[PDB]
Amino acid sequence: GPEEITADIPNVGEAALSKLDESGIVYIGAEVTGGDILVGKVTPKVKDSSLRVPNGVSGTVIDVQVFTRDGVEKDKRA
Amino acid sequence: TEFLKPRLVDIEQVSSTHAKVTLEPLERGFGHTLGNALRRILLSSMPGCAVTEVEIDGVLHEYSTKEGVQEDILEILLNLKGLAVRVQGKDEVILTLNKSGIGPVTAADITHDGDVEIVKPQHVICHLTDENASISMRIKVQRGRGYVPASTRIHSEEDERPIGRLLVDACYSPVERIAYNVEAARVEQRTDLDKLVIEMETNGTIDPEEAIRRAATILAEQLEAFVDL
Amino acid sequence: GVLKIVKVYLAVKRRIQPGDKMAGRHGNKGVISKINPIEDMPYDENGTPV
């Protein structure tokens, strides 16, 4: 089953989820640390196939560029 | 016990920020002894009034742009870090600055209050470069001694830091310059009595006499510990 | 095999810490290891530390 970006990540803590938007995407200007969720991508059978901050690094977030193949729907952020 | 106790015999505001001060009379070698310690204490120990907060009219991070302004946001933080102020009978306060139209900005533009003091109103703040341009920022001030990095501060606070609040490093010290000289001046109408002169440069936030007396009092605290054996 | 991508950038501000590599133009490379209370530094008769 194909992947999708969602805020409904399985079992992950609320605080990290708060950092994401309802699209499952961290906000621009956010401040993050190792393990903080950036992209809430998931896989069925559901699972947290998501992108998190590399361990041992902290930084501020400034960018979002979203790309899709032909025949794909967009999100509010994009 | 032949010691004559020195006193802060004279003070001089040679400049509105630079000052001179002298101590007399001083026993042999004590001028060097006190001079080194007082220099060391002043630089480290002095309590400072400094700014560490920026709330802005819509940018979300240090690296953000701004409409109709001459400089980037981050450069604004550097100017603010350079800016200094004195606060009366307070521990912290928030100040705001509002401007609109094409013009350069200075510390005087701030929404000053009588219980707050700006040491250099002429201090430079970033400029506006459009007729419809406008700035309306808010900044908070704190009392502290020494220096603190921004990252360490938030980790100690641990409460949520909302977007639009920007972090800068605290550099509290009201002063950073020390020169002191020992000279022979006439007391007891004889030689072997020492005269000490101190001079320093400041951001103007403190009275030099208070600085030495406050510093000396602080040193007395540590010195008193040696009686506690 | 993939039909949507997202790119995110992260900004890091870095000060100087012991072990950083420093170089002077005249081939004089070296690593710095200390940060001193400004009082400790040698200073001139004009009160200016290095």
Side-chain angles (χ1 to χ4, degrees):
Chain A
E3 295 172 327
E4 294 183 5
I5 316 304
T6 185
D8 305 1
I9 307 306
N11 66 77
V12 71
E14 303 299 324
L17 297 170
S18 301
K19 267 60 181 181
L20 296 181
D21 67 355
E22 309 310 329
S23 184
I25 308 173
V26 62
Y27 316 89
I28 279 181
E31 183 167 6
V32 297
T33 64
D36 295 333
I37 308 171
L38 305 180
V39 187
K41 191 183 65 170
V42 291
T43 42
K45 204 162 189 175
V46 294
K47 189 148 59 226
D48 64 329
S49 301
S50 55
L51 181 51
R52 289 169 270 250
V53 180
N55 300 329
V57 312
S58 301
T60 303
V61 179
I62 48 156
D63 183 1
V64 251
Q65 286 294 265
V66 184
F67 316 81
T68 75
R69 193 177 224 91
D70 183 7
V72 181
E73 65 187 344
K74 303 176 180 180
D75 97 310
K76 51 179 65 57
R77 294 286 295 277
Chain B
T1 312
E2 303 73 5
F3 304 84
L4 280 182
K5 311 306 178 297
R7 310 193 75 83
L8 46 143
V9 290
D10 187 358
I11 307 90
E12 175 177 0
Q13 191 75 54
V14 36
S15 98
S16 301
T17 60
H18 178 264
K20 270 177 177 287
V21 62
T22 168
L23 280 50
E24 184 186 7
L26 289 155
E27 300 297 338
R28 181 70 77 103
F30 284 75
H32 277 281
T33 314
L34 280 289
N36 175 38
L38 295 167
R39 167 179 179 279
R40 196 156 172 89
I41 288 287
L42 287 162
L43 292 163
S44 63
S45 314
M46 278 293 96
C49 176
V51 182
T52 291
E53 264 324 319
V54 189
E55 304 175 1
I56 306 182
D57 49 5
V59 302
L60 307 179
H61 48 81
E62 309 180 21
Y63 317 85
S64 174
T65 183
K66 168 64 177 187
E67 301 87 331
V69 291
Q70 170 78 7
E71 317 77 340
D72 299 359
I73 292 293
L74 173 54
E75 187 273 5
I76 317 197
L77 309 178
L78 303 178
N79 286 37
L80 296 166
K81 178 177 174 182
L83 181 142
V85 294
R86 186 213 316 247
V87 300
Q88 296 76 298
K90 270 190 303 306
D91 58 1
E92 60 95 336
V93 56
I94 289 178
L95 292 310
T96 74
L97 198 177
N98 286 33
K99 292 273 88 168
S100 181
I102 302 175
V105 185
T106 65
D109 307 310
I110 295 167
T111 58
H112 199 80
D113 300 330
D115 59 331
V116 179
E117 170 174 328
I118 288 167
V119 304
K120 185 181 179 179
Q122 305 82 352
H123 185 264
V124 57
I125 284 89
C126 316
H127 310 165
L128 293 69
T129 55
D130 197 328
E131 295 181 332
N132 57 11
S134 68
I135 59 173
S136 60
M137 289 56 164
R138 309 94 65 171
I139 55 180
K140 196 177 183 179
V141 192
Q142 314 180 32
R143 308 299 294 278
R145 53 185 184 82
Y147 158 94
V148 175
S151 62
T152 297
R153 182 171 74 89
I154 56 172
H155 282 301
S156 68
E157 298 168 356
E158 301 190 28
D159 57 328
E160 86 84 1
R161 197 271 295 164
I163 309 302
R165 263 191 171 176
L166 300 85
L167 320 172
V168 291
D169 292 1
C171 37
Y172 289 108
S173 178
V175 311
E176 66 310 332
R177 167 178 169 85
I178 295 294
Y180 71 85
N181 174 283
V182 288
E183 58 177 6
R186 195 86 301 98
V187 170
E188 283 186 338
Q189 66 275 355
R190 62 179 276 263
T191 52
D192 195 1
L193 285 87
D194 308 356
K195 163 80 151 180
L196 172 61
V197 182
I198 328 296
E199 38 276 310
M200 58 302 295
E201 174 56 299
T202 78
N203 48 39
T205 52
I206 65 170
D207 187 326
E209 199 209 49
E210 171 57 20
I212 59 174
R213 283 188 286 89
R214 202 180 190 95
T217 302
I218 293 164
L219 176 57
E221 307 294 44
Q222 310 313 94
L223 184 65
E224 173 164 326
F226 276 90
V227 89
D228 185 8
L229 326 175
Chain C
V2 296
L3 72 178
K4 65 164 50 180
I5 316 299
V6 295
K7 283 186 179 298
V8 178
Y9 295 163
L10 302 91
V12 177
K13 188 189 302 181
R14 267 153 158 175
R15 302 96 192 285
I16 314 94
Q17 291 300 341
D20 183 4
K21 192 177 181 184
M22 214 66 178
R25 286 182 291 180
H26 306 259
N28 49 320
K29 43 167 172 168
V31 305
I32 77 94
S33 59
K34 187 155 193 174
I35 200 67
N36 284 81
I38 301 169
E39 297 77 3
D40 311 324
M41 300 287 82
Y43 66 104
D44 56 53
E45 59 278 15
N46 203 341
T48 332
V50 299

